[PDB]
Amino acid sequence: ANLERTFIAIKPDGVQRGLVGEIIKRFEQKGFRLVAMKFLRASEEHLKQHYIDLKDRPFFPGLVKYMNSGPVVAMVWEGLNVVKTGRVMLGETNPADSKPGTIRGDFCIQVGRNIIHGSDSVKSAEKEISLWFKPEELVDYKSCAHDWVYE
Amino acid sequence: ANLERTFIAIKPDGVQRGLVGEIIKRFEQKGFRLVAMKFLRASEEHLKQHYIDLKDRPFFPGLVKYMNSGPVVAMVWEGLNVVKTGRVMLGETNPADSKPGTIRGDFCIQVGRNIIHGSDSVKSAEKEISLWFKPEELVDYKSCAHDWVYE
Amino acid sequence: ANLERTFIAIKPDGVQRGLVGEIIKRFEQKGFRLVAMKFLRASEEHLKQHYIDLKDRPFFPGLVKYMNSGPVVAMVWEGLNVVKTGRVMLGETNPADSKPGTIRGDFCIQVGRNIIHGSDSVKSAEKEISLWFKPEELVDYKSCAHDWVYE
Amino acid sequence: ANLERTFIAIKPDGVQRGLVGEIIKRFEQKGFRLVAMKFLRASEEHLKQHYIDLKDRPFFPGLVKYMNSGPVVAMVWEGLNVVKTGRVMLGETNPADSKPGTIRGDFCIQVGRNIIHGSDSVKSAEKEISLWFKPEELVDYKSCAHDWVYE
Amino acid sequence: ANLERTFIAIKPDGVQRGLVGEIIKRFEQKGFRLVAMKFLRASEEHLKQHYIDLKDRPFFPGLVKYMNSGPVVAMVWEGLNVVKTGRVMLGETNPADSKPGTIRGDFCIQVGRNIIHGSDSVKSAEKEISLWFKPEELVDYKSCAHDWVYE
Amino acid sequence: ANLERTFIAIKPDGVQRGLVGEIIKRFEQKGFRLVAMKFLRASEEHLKQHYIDLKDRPFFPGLVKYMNSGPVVAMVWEGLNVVKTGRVMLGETNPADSKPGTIRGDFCIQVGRNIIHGSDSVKSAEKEISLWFKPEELVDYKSCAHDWVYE
Ligand SMILES: Nc1nc2c(ncn2[C@@H]2O[C@H](COP(=O)(O)OP(=O)(O)O)[C@@H](O)[C@H]2O)c(=O)[nH]1
Numbered sequence: 001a002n003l004e005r006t007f008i009a010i011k012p013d014g015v016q017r018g019l020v021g022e023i024i025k026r027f028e029q030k031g032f033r034l035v036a037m038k039f040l041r042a043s044e045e046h047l048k049q050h051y052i053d054l055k056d057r058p059f060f061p062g063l064v065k066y067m068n069s070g071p072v073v074a075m076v077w078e079g080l081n082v083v084k085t086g087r088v089m090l091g092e093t094n095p096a097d098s099k100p101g102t103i104r105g106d107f108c109i110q111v112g113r114n115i116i117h118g119s120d121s122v123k124s125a126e127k128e129i130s131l132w133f134k135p136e137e138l139v140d141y142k143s144c145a146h147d148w149v150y151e
Numbered sequence: 152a153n154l155e156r157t158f159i160a161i162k163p164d165g166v167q168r169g170l171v172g173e174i175i176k177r178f179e180q181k182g183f184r185l186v187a188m189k190f191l192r193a194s195e196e197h198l199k200q201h202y203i204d205l206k207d208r209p210f211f212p213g214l215v216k217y218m219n220s221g222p223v224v225a226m227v228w229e230g231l232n233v234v235k236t237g238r239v240m241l242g243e244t245n246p247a248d249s250k251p252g253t254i255r256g257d258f259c260i261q262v263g264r265n266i267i268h269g270s271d272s273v274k275s276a277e278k279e280i281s282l283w284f285k286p287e288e289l290v291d292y293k294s295c296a297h298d299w300v301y302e
Numbered sequence: 303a304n305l306e307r308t309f310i311a312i313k314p315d316g317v318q319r320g321l322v323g324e325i326i327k328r329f330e331q332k333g334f335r336l337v338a339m340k341f342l343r344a345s346e347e348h349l350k351q352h353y354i355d356l357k358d359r360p361f362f363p364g365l366v367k368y369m370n371s372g373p374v375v376a377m378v379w380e381g382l383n384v385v386k387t388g389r390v391m392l393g394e395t396n397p398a399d400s401k402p403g404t405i406r407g408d409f410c411i412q413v414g415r416n417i418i419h420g421s422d423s424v425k426s427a428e429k430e431i432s433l434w435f436k437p438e439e440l441v442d443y444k445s446c447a448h449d450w451v452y453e
Numbered sequence: 454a455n456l457e458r459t460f461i462a463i464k465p466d467g468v469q470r471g472l473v474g475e476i477i478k479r480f481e482q483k484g485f486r487l488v489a490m491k492f493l494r495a496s497e498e499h500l501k502q503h504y505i506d507l508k509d510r511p512f513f514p515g516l517v518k519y520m521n522s523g524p525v526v527a528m529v530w531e532g533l534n535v536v537k538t539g540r541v542m543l544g545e546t547n548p549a550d551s552k553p554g555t556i557r558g559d560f561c562i563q564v565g566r567n568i569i570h571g572s573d574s575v576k577s578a579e580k581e582i583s584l585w586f587k588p589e590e591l592v593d594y595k596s597c598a599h600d601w602v603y604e
Numbered sequence: 605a606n607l608e609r610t611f612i613a614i615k616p617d618g619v620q621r622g623l624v625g626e627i628i629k630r631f632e633q634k635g636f637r638l639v640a641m642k643f644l645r646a647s648e649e650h651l652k653q654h655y656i657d658l659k660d661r662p663f664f665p666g667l668v669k670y671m672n673s674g675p676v677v678a679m680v681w682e683g684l685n686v687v688k689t690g691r692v693m694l695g696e697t698n699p700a701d702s703k704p705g706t707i708r709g710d711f712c713i714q715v716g717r718n719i720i721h722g723s724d725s726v727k728s729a730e731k732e733i734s735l736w737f738k739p740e741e742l743v744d745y746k747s748c749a750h751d752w753v754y755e
Numbered sequence: 756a757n758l759e760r761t762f763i764a765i766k767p768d769g770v771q772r773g774l775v776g777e778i779i780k781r782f783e784q785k786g787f788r789l790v791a792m793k794f795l796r797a798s799e800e801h802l803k804q805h806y807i808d809l810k811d812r813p814f815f816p817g818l819v820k821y822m823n824s825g826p827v828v829a830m831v832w833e834g835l836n837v838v839k840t841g842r843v844m845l846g847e848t849n850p851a852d853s854k855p856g857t858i859r860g861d862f863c864i865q866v867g868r869n870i871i872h873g874s875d876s877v878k879s880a881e882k883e884i885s886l887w888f889k890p891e892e893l894v895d896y897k898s899c900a901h902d903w904v905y906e
Pocket residue numbers: 059062063092093111112113114116117118120453
């Protein structure tokens with residue numbers, strides 16, 4: 001079997017604020033498997049592609065500027081319902097609506113600096129994963145705790 | 152005052168995944184008192200008795216085999232409303248409906264591998280405590296912080 | 303921009319139970335700026351002024367006595383919507399109603415020993431700040447991660 | 454085959470100060486396997502046998518009373534060189550001589566309240582294990598990470 | 605007993621890097637009692653008096669400027685051998701000589717940005733305590749865990 | 756004036772045991788800057804190159820086999836004295852000789868499963884960085900806390 005995959009990206013503010021280890025640890029503890037990961041400064045064209053569906057938003061140019069202002073940690077996580085559950089772990093788009101215990105709820109304040117990105121549907125995930133990673137960048141291996149995480 | 156008690160068991164997957172100390176710490180921090188604790192592999196008959204109310208459910212056989220597949224940490228915790236609060240701390244039966252911050256919300260994914268058990272009512276607690284522990288196994292002592300936790 | 307501020311006080315039980323560093327860390331991680339902080343045993347008169355609203359309440363004398371029973375860590379934190387968000391972080395007045403992830407949800411059990419105080423509104427905040435701190439005690443400085451927390 | 458084993462006991466002060474989960478987590482993270490564990494108030498006679506080699510020391514009577522003053526968490530941990538390594542993890546007998554990073558270096562101050570006990574040699578471990586546990590109390594199972602901890 | 609006390613200050617870089625709660629937590633966990641605490645930006649004259657014996661050193665002017673560049677958390681901690689032990693917990697003056705497990709070993713890199721200060725002797729401690737605090741700012745209370753930390 | 760750089764790789768056992776976030780966090784807290792990072796399963800040929808100096812050692816074939824048995828997190832960290840300090844943080848080659856507080860001292864037991872690699876000299880670091888990364892994979896940005904970590 002092949003389980004669901006989602007695209008998670010730690011934004012420049014998460015890297016600048018030293019929260020990379022803390023964020024990854026939350027996904028590891030939950031039981032998800034890390035499939036791919038790289039560190040890079042994404043180009044504006046790339047980011048425009050990534051946030052294309054928002055190209056007509058007022059905040060769009062500023063968003064792209066900021067996502068290009070520093071490096072990003074791009075990752076692919078695998079697991080049962082990882083897309084929806086990953087979204088629950090992140091919190092709401094606006095940290096102000098996020099609850100303590102969530103990543104945005106514990107670590108940030110403003111929607112313009114909300115430290116992380118997570119695909120909002122399987123459909124987006126597949127598109128984002130293809131945008132940021134070559135197929136040969138996805139590593140398949142089996143977690144030793146697999147049978148202790150799944151029936 | 153003779154306070155309320157609940158029965159909590161870390162399931163085989165919690166032990167296998169190295170979460171014993173992490174889970175116990177959550178109860179200590181909260182202010183609850185550890186009354187009893189032992190480590191053992193429960194027999195299938197012992198497990199059917201614990202979950203006797205689920206005997207006619209389709210998943211019953213696989214639940215018993217899973218619970219017998221490794222050791223369990225059985226504990227009794229005491230405190231004001233510990234039954235109901237212990238339940239809130241665990242999260243929902245299905246990790247997918249559990250919120251970040253709860254034990255199942257932070258550490259597991261699937262209902263069949265949901266790392267922990269907590270009595271659901273005082274009636275159930277008293278029954279589970281009697282099934283798992285001999286009266287001489289419950290320890291009575293007073294916490295030094297008692298007056299800082301209770302009025 | 304001279305942002306919003308709130309008064310947070312770690313009650314005597316929070317100090318006695320060794321939770322000072324743990325609580326402060328939660329505010330620092332979130333991105334709030336520490337503006338003032340002092341450690342003191344507040345007098346009864348000073349405490350009756352602080353909780354002047356609940357003077358007619360039955361628990362009042364008990365509250366004042368416990369608040370005076372040990373030292374308190376008084377602080378002022380600054381940030382966008384810090385008053386409302388600080389309240390979300392603390393949880394409900396009653397630890398029983400506070401969710402895991404919040405300060406009261408993770409660390410305490412009873413309303414009479416609920417480890418921390420946070421202003422409930424901007425107006426209460428301004429009043430409590432004036433009551434607990436002299437103007438020279440509010441320190442002026444900028445956080446190096448300011449631009450990573452705010453747009 | 455069967456690896457080395459050591460007896461570890463969290464003293465009454467470790468339980469009272471809420472460090473049970475924290476200490477257990479240190480052994481789990483290291484990769485050691487928990488073999489047995491129970492919570493009890495040890496009798497004075499049992500404690501005199503345990504510390505029989507120190508019966509003529511001036512602190513002996515006080516050591517026995519303090520060890521009997523509250524419950525203890527008795528455990529058996531298994532692993533390659535666990536006796537000697539368990540000792541390095543604990544720190545020196547006197548917390549004053551223990552380095553930060555060790556259990557006593559991090560959590561305590563005085564030799565008379567040094568929170569934990571660990572066997573000092575394979576011979577002692579075998580004697581203490583026999584003194585505190587019945588054969589049926591040592592659980593047999595294999596860790597899922599075993600092949601990731603050992604060649 | 606009249607327990608020994610030491611002066612600890614978290615330097616401007618510790619505050620800026622969000623390490624205040626983390627540092628305080630280490631002293632609380634160890635069993636030391638917080639006696640006094642305040643947050644302030646010290647004047648250059650105040651800092652020259654504090655570091656008076658280093659007035660002829662090359663780095664002195666740079667040290668006084670850095671220390672005045674942001675606020676400081678000034679604290680007094682109490683405990684058996686707290687002066688010498690607090691020093692052990694800090695690590696070496698040069699973070700590069702500091703071992704993992706110590707505060708400087710874990711959190712910093714360069715001698716000119718070494719996040720914390722601790723008195724180097726009882727004589728110095730008493731002099732620094734007098735310099736930074738007035739008598740009425742040192743709070744006396746007894747920790748509830750006192751008898752579990754000391755014989 | 757660019758700073759020293761070192762090559763750090765989390766071995767297959769570190770990934771399998773869910774320690775990726777925990778390890779990265781230790782380097783972030785210390786004040787080092789992440790320059791490059793990728794997740795991959797290294798080929799045997801790549802691994803022989805990496806450990807070419809040990810090719811005639813008895814344990815060499817087994818080393819290469821295990822290093823290829825799972826994915827590796829390859830990273831480049833930058834900072835003052837990062838090569839020697841990264842080494843101190845890792846601990847000794849044999850975990851048995853590693854002190855608590857170090858990565859190997861806290862997380863592993865045997866030399867053949869010692870979770871992490873770190874360049875041992877500046878010369879080794881430059882060779883390893885060239886072997887694992889392309890020049891365009893190294894990201895240059897400045898940390899917002901730079902002036903609080905360095906004079
Ligand atoms: N500056 C600013 N950016 C926003 C706003 N709403 C959305 N964004 C940002 O653009 C990202 C994409 O928006 P959206 O797809 O709705 O949110 P997400 O999928 O939860 O990240 C959000 O994470 C924020 O970084 C806004 O009102 N102001």
